[PDB]
Amino acid sequence: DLDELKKEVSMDDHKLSLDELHNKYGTDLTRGLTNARAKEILARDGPNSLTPPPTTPEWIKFCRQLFGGFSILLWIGAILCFLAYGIQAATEDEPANDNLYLGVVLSTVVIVTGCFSYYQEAKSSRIMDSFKNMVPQQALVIRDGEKSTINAEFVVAGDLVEVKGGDRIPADLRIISAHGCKVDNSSLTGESEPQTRSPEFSSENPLETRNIAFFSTNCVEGTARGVVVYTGDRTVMGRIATLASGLEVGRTPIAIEIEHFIHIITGVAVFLGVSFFILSLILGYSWLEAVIFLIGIIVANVPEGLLATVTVCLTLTAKRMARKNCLVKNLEAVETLGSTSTICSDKTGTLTQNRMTVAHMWFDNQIHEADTTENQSGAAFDKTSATWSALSRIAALCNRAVFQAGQDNVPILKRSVAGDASESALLKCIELCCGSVQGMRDRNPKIVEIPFNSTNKYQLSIHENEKSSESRYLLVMKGAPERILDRCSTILLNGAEEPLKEDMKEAFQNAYLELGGLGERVLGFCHFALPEDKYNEGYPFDADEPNFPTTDLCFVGLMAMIDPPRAAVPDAVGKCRSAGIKVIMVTGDHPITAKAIAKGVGIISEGNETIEDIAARLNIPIGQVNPRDAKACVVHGSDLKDLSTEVLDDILHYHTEIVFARTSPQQKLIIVEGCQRQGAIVAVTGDGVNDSPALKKADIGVAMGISGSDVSKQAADMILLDDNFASIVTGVEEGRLIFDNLKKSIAYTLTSNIPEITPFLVFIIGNVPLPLGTVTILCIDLGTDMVPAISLAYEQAESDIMKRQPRNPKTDKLVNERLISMAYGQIGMIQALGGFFSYFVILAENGFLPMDLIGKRVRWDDRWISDVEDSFGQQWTYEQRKIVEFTCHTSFFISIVVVQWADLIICKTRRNSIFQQGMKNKILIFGLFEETALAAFLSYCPGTDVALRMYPLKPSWWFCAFPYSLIIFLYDEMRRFIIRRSPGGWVEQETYY
Amino acid sequence: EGPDNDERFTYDYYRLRVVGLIVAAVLCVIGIIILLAGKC
Amino acid sequence: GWKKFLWDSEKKEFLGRTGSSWFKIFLFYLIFYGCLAGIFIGTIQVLLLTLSDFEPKYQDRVAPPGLSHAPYAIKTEISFSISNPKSYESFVKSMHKLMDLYNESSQAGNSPFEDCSDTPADYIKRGDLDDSQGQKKACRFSRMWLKNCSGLDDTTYGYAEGKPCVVAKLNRIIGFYPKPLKNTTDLPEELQANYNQYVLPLRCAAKREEDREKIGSIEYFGLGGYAGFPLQYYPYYGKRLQKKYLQPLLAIQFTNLTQNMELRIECKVYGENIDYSEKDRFRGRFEVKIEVKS
Ligand SMILES: *[C@@H]1O[C@H](CO[C@@H]2O[C@@H](C)[C@@H](O)[C@@H](O)[C@@H]2O)[C@@H](O[C@@H]2O[C@H](CO)[C@@H](O[C@@H]3O[C@H](CO[C@H]4O[C@H](CO)[C@@H](O)[C@H](O)[C@@H]4O)[C@@H](O)[C@H](O[C@H]4O[C@H](CO)[C@@H](O)[C@H](O)[C@@H]4O)[C@@H]3O)[C@H](O)[C@H]2NC(C)=O)[C@H](O)[C@H]1NC(C)=O
Ligand SMILES: *[C@@H]1O[C@H](CO[C@@H]2O[C@@H](C)[C@@H](O)[C@@H](O)[C@@H]2O)[C@@H](O[C@@H]2O[C@H](CO)[C@@H](O[C@@H]3O[C@H](CO)[C@@H](O)[C@H](O[C@H]4O[C@H](CO)[C@@H](O)[C@H](O)[C@@H]4O)[C@@H]3O)[C@H](O)[C@H]2NC(C)=O)[C@H](O)[C@H]1NC(C)=O
Ligand SMILES: CCCCCCCC/C=C\CCCCCCCC(=O)OC[C@H](COP(=O)(O)OCC[N+](C)(C)C)OC(=O)CCCCCCC/C=C\CCCCCCCC
Ligand SMILES: CCCCCCCC/C=C\CCCCCCCC(=O)OC[C@H](COP(=O)(O)OCC[N+](C)(C)C)OC(=O)CCCCCCC/C=C\CCCCCCCC
Ligand SMILES: CCCCCCCC/C=C\CCCCCCCC(=O)OC[C@H](COP(=O)(O)OCC[N+](C)(C)C)OC(=O)CCCCCCC/C=C\CCCCCCCC
């Protein structure tokens, strides 16, 4: 699978002849191949079917979820715990069962998190599998001189294949004879209109010539013949799909943030372990003990509850998106939208609707605009003049297309119409504002019609007049405005008729250039009432001689048409630009149309100008003007092929409104890479297969759901099941909201680490009784704390998020030193002090004053000393003092919860005050209530001092942590105050997360 | 008091546990109420 | 990176900041931690002002007194060879440490020791738990009272010829009055004989029914010759109000001990305000695993 030979632009043998082609592959132009030869080739190289994607067993992805970056840290923590247990077992007897329980708990946490994440990705995979609808298809091949319909998987290279309007091109054919055969190259080449396929060659680029049919393309109208040149995976889209599958995935920004977070947590953990190891060795402990202490401290400094919390946070933001019809296949792809700073979009199928629609109409020397929006939410065009009625009759009559049987349910715009695109748009507009066309057509019987000639460039027909008072005949013709203009002498103004003096002729020329400059295709409709005296009701006008006056007709008006954009496209583009997101158009369509769509959707803001526009406004050559005075630039694909890396960098570095036109899929990928080379996140939004290599390499791909291709849908990361472009704005907003919420939740889960480690440090340095047991740290990290951290995700915005500039990736991180200085440095310290206070109080009320506690651990732990004198002289047995120590553990855990109340309230908002934002988050309130109820239940429930070793507390102890909590609230309140009054001051660059 | 000062060494932990449980239950209820207050 | 973030020569920065920045951060943290320490100290001083110096506010975790002994056993086992002298040294050392506090030289003069009834007597109340009267007075407890286990005649205390002793002691509790069982028809078998109301009885036995035969003659030594604690040494007024206070002791000689075999001996005290616990094996009673292997 040579990638470089797949990265190159497609080559071909189009520039040849029919004899050279038949001589190279071997094939009779009038008899095709033989059955024996056909089977010989079928078995010689393989069926004309694309290879299936690389499957994936479920245990493989389950193992993938069990690993990663965070889960690996927890895995090493569990391993360390078991190592310390093995040591304690080999050196002493009666090893406390602490390390083993902690290790099994960490392993269980990792397994549960993996199961949850895997279940979510499986849910998305199932709903994704319910969209692949593959119905077998059979092609028409001519062998030995006979026509036969065989499965698409049996077509080989060399046989003759015939196509008919409505069928799909099987393989890559070389047209040999066509009969007005049009093809739809929107998915592969992105051409919005049907390009006619002719046996002759026209352009050096195989995608531009008309003598080559492409795989997966459909023949709109006409019939054609052709020799299969390319078959199977070797086809154009086959190489594109193979290239898409042979691309890497990448590493999202959220993953990099999690990685840098683990890096910091490990730095501080190994630093505290090696430092207290050297200190303990300086105080006399033995080697065996120092190793255990080191492992224990490195294990304590790790957050086991932060994993489930982060997973639930991301899942919460994902369900909302699923409520609005925005589905994500992965779980971290929900944040990439918020960090995006450059959106590369596609035109056909993404920015537009890929459907021809009547845009502007000319009548009564006045340009009229029609509604070209999917749901028909706009302004009417004043349907009160007679001119419009005559126009409706001309268009509704001189038209051969008719809605496909059985569409009585779909809307007027989304129904299937058999015919050309122009006639379809005209029929839809008439059926939209003029009622049922079937009755309008049966109300006037068509007598004689002259088809559309390539020379006549006009379609005319005569029908009877439904006027019950006029039995005359009506003649209606339509065609190019110039040809029709040269055949008229009157004009239907406001109903009456008038001459065709040069005044209206010039107004018609200006109208023609006005509608033409808009990138639209304009047509002209005219009619004439045949005098029943010279052509009676019985005379038959056979289409042979000049039976109708070609000239002296009555021109009624022009009718333009073009593919419009989706409803919420301009608003969404404006919203993205407001948030500082650079919108760059990337499409393989004509530049004359790409520029118009860009200006119409907001990519090229009205007022900006290109070098060609300046040269045209000044009437000077283009080589004289300076390219720095042009903000917007239109880069052609042909020119992009001959451009160096630095040139592309400068193109993106100096032009703010860039539009890449006529760019091949490989060039699209090159553009995405050129955008990443600088350092900005990229989001590519597409629908066809030409977007597959762009959606894969981009930081985040957005594929359309209804109008999207299966390849681009399978290679993308986010799917828009409703084809609504506003979902991009909603996503960029949610990505930011969940980022600030992740920061708050991280600070919350990290503040409690200090009041959970300091006790052990003072236990080893000061030799006092153990203040915080291991089962209490477990009841805190994996219990109470879970609900509040989860609630911190439901926090609303503080300021307008859709107003600030995108976060800088190289400077603004997720976990900086400003956070560590708060959690580990200021709040955690106060919480630890409160815990130690409750501790000393409990031990002082029972008889052990603080002066006699320093230096007792040696005898306080000894299991054979049943007489420990206290500060008053009483003798305490081993179990009695142990019961008191356990009660101190229970009170310490409750003190932790008490200080966590104020920590959750000060963590709710990062800058604003509590009296401003408000306590409207019901989840947070429920979290506080549950956090307290759980502690009371764990302490007062009978049988807990036996199972978990937690004794009941006396009503006077519960109030030892209250002052510390209020103090924390006051400190953070005044902190979040100087930041507001003094923007940019010390408090901001020192404590503003 | 004097010789029969047995009360000086007794504490009614039972009643304490009962009250603490009643309060815990009440707090849990209130929490649930606030959580569901709005979805009905 | 590595080198730059450590020391650059253009902005004259070290680790990231200039000279005055590290100073600003250090000063801020110093003031913050200083205030933290001062507040914690104040909140601890109010606590010291809340407690009394003559009595512990809560005395419920030490209601049922324990029963400790003089030898220091690692697993409540006494195993020593009658031949190797370096086998029972850890025992004699402990025993000696305990008895070394009852030396007559320490108990001398009127203050603060007072001669009490040579025969068990009733309680003695030296007033309330106040500082009005000076340091209270405690009864004297002579070493010689313990006859064959006193370290005055046979320093080893018995371990020399297969006849070890075990000095039992009741855990000191402030304001605790020991109360013995009454002469009513309901009383253990053992306690019937020698019902001196003023003596708290202590009696050892065998944990299992089999071991009975393998255990010989339990000879108890104590105040007045009884196997208990005289009620006159109570109550205890606490260290502050009764320094130089001695608690009664009871010696137990396990004569006629089977050789080369682990014997489980459980000693137990009886009384109203005495209750045992299935979790704490030292509350009121105690277990010893003697094995005189020779
Ligand atoms: C409480 O009383 C303890 C015993 O008091 C003795 O008996 C009472 C009834 C009175 O008569 C009193 O006057 C007696 O002293 C008392 O402990 C005793 O302290 C002395 C002084 O150190 C010790 O004497 C020394 O003995 C060692 C050898 O001891 C051997 O036996 C003991 C067991 O008894 C073992 O533990 C040892 O390991 C030995 O196996 C002698 O080597 C040592 O020599 C020193 O003196 C000689 C002159 O005699 C000098 O030439 C040397 O250079 C040395 O300076 C002493 O003779 C005595 O052993 C010890 N008794 C016990 C049982 O340990 C205790 O101190 C008192 N405590 C208080 C707080 O009042
Ligand atoms: C604690 O309690 C014991 C037992 O008390 C007895 O049982 C209690 C449950 C309750 O019912 C008491 O009312 C009851 O007395 C006390 O010890 C007992 O003392 C008596 C009197 O000395 C003994 O009875 C003697 O029994 C002898 C044979 O066993 C008999 O020969 C004795 O004769 C004496 O009395 C007769 C008149 O009956 C007289 O004629 C004789 O000349 C001679 O004096 C006498 O009947 C019991 O055996 C004792 N019980 C035991 C277990 O030894 C004990 O004194 C008491 N302690 C205190 C401090 O009060
Ligand atoms: C029994 C007793 C109990 C004891 C309990 C102890 C509990 C431990 C509590 C806290 C642990 C502290 C450990 C150190 C934490 C430092 C945090 C840290 O390392 O965070 C990492 C930051 C990175 O941040 P960033 O990603 O934003 O960088 C972006 C840079 N870009 C963008 C320019 C490229 O790196 C930096 O900050 C740079 C590194 C700065 C390192 C400073 C080291 C100071 C440590 C000790 C000083 C002691 C001196 C005492 C004497 C004072 C004089 C009297
Ligand atoms: C000595 C002891 C020390 C203890 C220290 C720890 C303390 C931590 C615990 C509680 C702290 C409570 C802090 C009180 C803050 C009140 C702030 C407030 O009231 O700001 C008013 C807000 C602002 O409104 P606005 O103008 O934006 O509205 C606009 C409406 N529009 C849009 C229609 C116009 O109004 C709103 O938020 C809407 C109404 C919200 C009402 C909230 C009431 C619940 C408050 C606390 C719950 C109790 C938790 C107890 C935990 C213990 C469990 C056992
Ligand atoms: C929206 C949804 C709402 C759902 C809310 C659900 C809330 C559930 C509320 C209550 C159910 C809790 C479980 C009940 C346990 C009953 C245990 C019990 O009745 O024990 C009685 C006996 C004690 O007898 P004794 O006094 O003679 O013993 C003397 C022992 N001496 C003398 C040797 C010291 O027990 C014994 O003997 C053996 C003791 C066995 C230990 C069992 C304790 C379980 C340990 C950990 C599980 C707790 C996890 C936390 C779950 C939180 C959920 C929110």
Ligand SMILES: CCCCCCCC/C=C\CCCCCCCC(=O)OC[C@H](COP(=O)(O)OCC[N+](C)(C)C)OC(=O)CCCCCCC/C=C\CCCCCCCC
């Ligand atoms: C959504 C909100 C959730 C809230 C729930 C709180 C989360 C809790 C998080 C971590 C706590 C789990 C730690 C497990 C502790 C096991 C302790 C253990 O095994 O100790 C072993 C003891 C032995 O003691 P010893 O040597 O003194 O015996 C001497 C006996 N002599 C002397 C008489 C012979 O044996 C015994 O206690 C025998 C009785 C066995 C008791 C097993 C109790 C298991 C408790 C929890 C496990 C299930 C939790 C699942 C919920 C997860 C929530 C996410």
Ligand SMILES: CCCCCCCC/C=C\CCCCCCCC(=O)OC[C@H](COP(=O)(O)OCC[N+](C)(C)C)OC(=O)CCCCCCC/C=C\CCCCCCCC
């Ligand atoms: C039991 C638990 C008890 C806990 C109690 C904690 C109480 C301690 C609270 C605060 C003490 C710390 C005060 C430190 C003052 C020296 C700091 C200093 O040297 O700062 C210098 C700067 C002035 O330099 P610059 O910005 O002009 O230079 C620009 C330079 N460039 C560019 C780098 C920004 O100072 C400034 O900015 C002004 C900023 C001053 C910092 C205000 C922080 C106030 C926070 C809390 C006070 C509220 C206590 C409420 C307690 C109620 C108890 C019931």
Ligand SMILES: CCCCCCCC/C=C\CCCCCCCC(=O)OC[C@H](COP(=O)(O)OCC[N+](C)(C)C)OC(=O)CCCCCCC/C=C\CCCCCCCC
């Ligand atoms: C906005 C947020 C709203 C949050 C509301 C949360 C709901 C609170 C839910 C319940 C709290 C009430 C608890 C009442 C329990 C009394 C039960 C009782 O009988 O308990 C007696 C103990 C005395 O125990 P002992 O050891 O002496 O005897 C032990 C004797 N043995 C052991 C031998 C029996 O006493 C005790 O537990 C004392 C109980 C604690 C006293 C409550 C103090 C309230 C503190 C601040 C609130 C002030 C509000 C001011 C209003 C402002 C309006 C603008």
Ligand SMILES: CCCCCCCC/C=C\CCCCCCCC(=O)OC[C@H](COP(=O)(O)OCC[N+](C)(C)C)OC(=O)CCCCCCC/C=C\CCCCCCCC
């Ligand atoms: C949508 C609306 C939802 C509403 C739901 C409402 C739920 C119901 C609410 C409250 C129910 C209250 C139940 C009160 C139970 C009292 C039990 C009690 O007082 O037992 C105490 C005694 C044990 O005393 P001790 O002598 O061993 O003490 C130790 C003495 N030393 C250690 C010094 C020797 O019990 C014993 O002996 C026998 C104990 C037998 C086992 C009883 C099981 C109780 C366990 C859990 C029930 C509590 C759940 C409350 C809900 C909390 C939600 C988070």
Ligand SMILES: *[C@@H]1O[C@H](CO)[C@@H](O[C@@H]2O[C@H](CO)[C@@H](O)[C@H](O)[C@H]2NC(C)=O)[C@H](O)[C@H]1NC(C)=O
């Ligand atoms: C101490 O125990 C010994 C046994 O170890 C007792 O002496 C034995 O008595 C039996 C008769 O019942 C004789 O057959 C043995 O030969 C004796 N053995 C020895 C070593 O003497 C002795 O009676 C016990 N003494 C006490 C006071 O309990």
Ligand SMILES: CC(C)CCC[C@@H](C)[C@H]1CC[C@H]2[C@@H]3CC=C4C[C@@H](O)CC[C@]4(C)[C@H]3CC[C@]12C
């Ligand atoms: C228990 C006691 C004695 C330990 C006291 C440790 C104190 C002095 C430690 C704990 C955390 C530390 C701080 C944590 C974070 C930062 C941010 C970093 O970019 C520079 C160092 C700085 C400013 C540290 C200074 C020293 C500090 C406050």
Ligand SMILES: CC(C)CCC[C@@H](C)[C@H]1CC[C@H]2[C@@H]3CC=C4C[C@@H](O)CC[C@]4(C)[C@H]3CC[C@]12C
């Ligand atoms: C919003 C804020 C200020 C409310 C703070 C409420 C605090 C003070 C409440 C919440 C739960 C309460 C405790 C819950 C349980 C017990 C056990 C019970 O047997 C006596 C009351 C006692 C000891 C309560 C004392 C007061 C307490 C701690």
Ligand SMILES: CC(C)CCC[C@@H](C)[C@H]1CC[C@H]2[C@@H]3CC=C4C[C@@H](O)CC[C@]4(C)[C@H]3CC[C@]12C
């Ligand atoms: C608001 C904050 C910053 C004020 C903190 C004040 C601190 C420094 C004050 C408050 C209470 C004071 C203590 C209270 C009690 C004692 C005992 C006395 O025999 C000597 C002074 C000493 C040791 C004091 C030292 C200073 C102290 C701890």
Ligand SMILES: [Mg+2]
């Ligand atoms: Mg497209």
Ligand code: NA
């Ligand atoms: Na990707």
Ligand code: NA
């Ligand atoms: Na932790």
